[PDB]
Structure 1
Amino acid sequence: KYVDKIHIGNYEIDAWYFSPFPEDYGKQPKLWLCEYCLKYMKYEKSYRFHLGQCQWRQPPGKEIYRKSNISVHEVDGKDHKIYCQNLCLLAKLFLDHKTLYFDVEPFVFYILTEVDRQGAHIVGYFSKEKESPDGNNVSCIMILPPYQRRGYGRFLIAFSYELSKLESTVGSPEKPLSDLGKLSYRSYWSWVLLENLRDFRGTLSIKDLSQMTSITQNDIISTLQSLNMVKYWKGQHVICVTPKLVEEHLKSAQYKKPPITVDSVCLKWAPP
């Protein structure tokens, strides 16, 4: 009765939440999605027919990042409305709190793919308001279940701050965050701030760290509080840490997986 399982590419994936695909699509045992254009179909036969006809082998929009077989496409919701609506309905399967599926024109979408000889395979994405009155640099961020906890979420969160740096602005993801999203941001912020605290020593203020990382002062403070690296003096949070305590944190299992890194040399983008 609601969609509860999808087939996309070589994966079958169970749903986590309701998504408002048309009612008729929910009635089927599975929903079949083209992994390139994201069209959703009701039958294995209409899916197989589509696979032989469809000419897409990557997302639409512009490839703004490519390094080896990792790529990011920027897709404006006004230029590619149907693709973006399809992506939003797919994402809502895994996001409890996303509420926008059809009115995609105010958004830009950054689609992460991993490329082989067959084409560019969607891993996840994040959406971002073209104009955010609140300074949100991510609206929703979703990594499909088979790629979760494998470094792709870390890449996309880093990528989102790389755009913010290019815009000379700080940014924070729109709340509420998902459960995975919270853990992932907390770990990313800790990593970035600890690595900057290692490389300086260093007369870095919180404002300094915000300008260097595009992480907001508030998210830096809440992170530094969770690491017990801040003292408070007459109304001001101030950094307080030894080089050694910084290394103790970084030696921990959390920060030991080799990251897929965002190479600024491979990013092609300027503020619109």
Structure 2
Amino acid sequence: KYVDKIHIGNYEIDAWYFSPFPEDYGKQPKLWLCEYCLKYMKYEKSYRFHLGQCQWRQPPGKEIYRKSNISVHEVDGKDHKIYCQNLCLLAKLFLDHKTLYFDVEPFVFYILTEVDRQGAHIVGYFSKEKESPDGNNVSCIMILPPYQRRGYGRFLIAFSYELSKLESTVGSPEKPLSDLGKLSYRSYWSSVLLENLRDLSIKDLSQMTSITQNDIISTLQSLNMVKYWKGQHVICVTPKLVEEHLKSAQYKKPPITVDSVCLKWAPP
């Protein structure tokens, strides 16, 4: 038997995928997780006891973004191994393709939290290779189900690219993306490129956004905004065409914006 259900904070969440918690934890009807330190437990009574003991009220690591009650913590996999392993086991319940859970030292993790009087409540995260040979600015990205489709994933996507900008690099998420991940990246890419075209070569879009040229091209193709001329993709759009796409109901929900002013982060 696998873990099929978790209790975290005030949520109960059904699993989507196998995650390799120890055998004796899977056998339980439900796993209970401290929303702050991510310790996983077998019983409600040990969970209730931990809640009265645990002194964490937010992720470890450094708070590298705070605007109002939205917060991002940077956590080095080498400085906080247990926490990051628990995070990976949690994430694997909702990620089909994640394969790495216990070798966390090559990764840094960016934890998104929503804050209230009681603490910084975990919403999702993305991991990132400290050294990405293939130029990936995201390794795995996960939003817990009760927060999906609510602007948090778009926030984390925009956040990964702001880091890429500060590093003077382009980056792409490591593939394969989940189904929701695909739609989310395509929608974010479209929003960003359509906004830049409203107020430019493909290379300039890539340098202004840190989106790779391939991701730009494939998005402009899906928008039918590129011409081909002698082996070269070339942007072919009328400012009115841009505006028509932006008025569509795709880009109608007001984002949680990433305010670069509130991002306290220098490149490694």
TM-fit CA distance, 1:108 = 0.1
Residue 72 of structure 1 is matched in structure 2 by: 72
String of CA shifts for 1:10-67, please: whole Å, max 9, x gaps.
0000000000000000011100000000000000000000000000000000000000
TM-fit CA distance, 1:270 = 0.8
SS in 1 for 2:90: helix
TM-fit CA distance, 1:260 = 0.3
- Paired with 2:161 and 2:14, the residues of 1 have a C-alpha distance of 31
- Paired with 1:139 and 1:15, the residues of 2 have a C-alpha distance of 21
String of CA shifts for 1:204-235, please: whole Å, max 9, x gaps.
00000000000000000000000000000000
String of CA shifts for 1:179-219, please: whole Å, max 9, x gaps.
110000000000000000001xxxx0000000000000000
Residue 255 of structure 2 is matched in structure 1 by: 259
TM-fit CA distance, 1:177 = 0.6
**Equivalent residues, number:** 268
TM-fit CA distance, 1:105 = 0.1
TM-fit CA distance, 1:100 = 0.1
Runs of 4+ residues deviating >4 angstroms: none
SS in 1 for 2:17: coil
TM-fit CA distance, 1:257 = 0.3
String of CA shifts for 1:56-108, please: whole Å, max 9, x gaps.
00000000000000000000000000000000000000000000000000000
TM-fit CA distance, 1:261 = 0.1
SS in 2 for 1:262: coil
- Paired with 1:22 and 1:61, the residues of 2 have a C-alpha distance of 26
SS in 2 for 1:95: coil
TM-fit CA distance, 1:239 = 0.1
TM-fit CA distance, 1:135 = 0.2
In structure 2, stretches of 5+ residues that fail to align are: none
- Paired with 1:19 and 1:155, the residues of 2 have a C-alpha distance of 26
SS in 1 for 2:79: coil
TM-fit CA distance, 1:3 = 0.1
TM-fit CA distance, 1:137 = 0.2
- Paired with 2:267 and 2:181, the residues of 1 have a C-alpha distance of 25
SS in 2 for 1:37: coil
Residue 216 of structure 2 is matched in structure 1 by: 220
- Paired with 1:84 and 1:271, the residues of 2 have a C-alpha distance of 21
- Paired with 2:121 and 2:238, the residues of 1 have a C-alpha distance of 44
- Paired with 1:129 and 1:226, the residues of 2 have a C-alpha distance of 29
Structure 2 length-normalised TM: 1.00
- Paired with 2:250 and 2:63, the residues of 1 have a C-alpha distance of 31
- Paired with 1:237 and 1:28, the residues of 2 have a C-alpha distance of 55
- Paired with 1:19 and 1:180, the residues of 2 have a C-alpha distance of 19
- Paired with 1:12 and 1:226, the residues of 2 have a C-alpha distance of 38
SS in 2 for 1:158: helix
- Paired with 1:157 and 1:115, the residues of 2 have a C-alpha distance of 20
- Paired with 2:180 and 2:224, the residues of 1 have a C-alpha distance of 23
Q: How does 1:1-272 map to 2 (within 5 A)?
A: 1-199=1-199, 204-272=200-268
- Paired with 1:237 and 1:64, the residues of 2 have a C-alpha distance of 38
String of CA shifts for 1:119-174, please: whole Å, max 9, x gaps.
00000000000000000000000000000000000000000000000000000000
SS in 2 for 1:131: coil
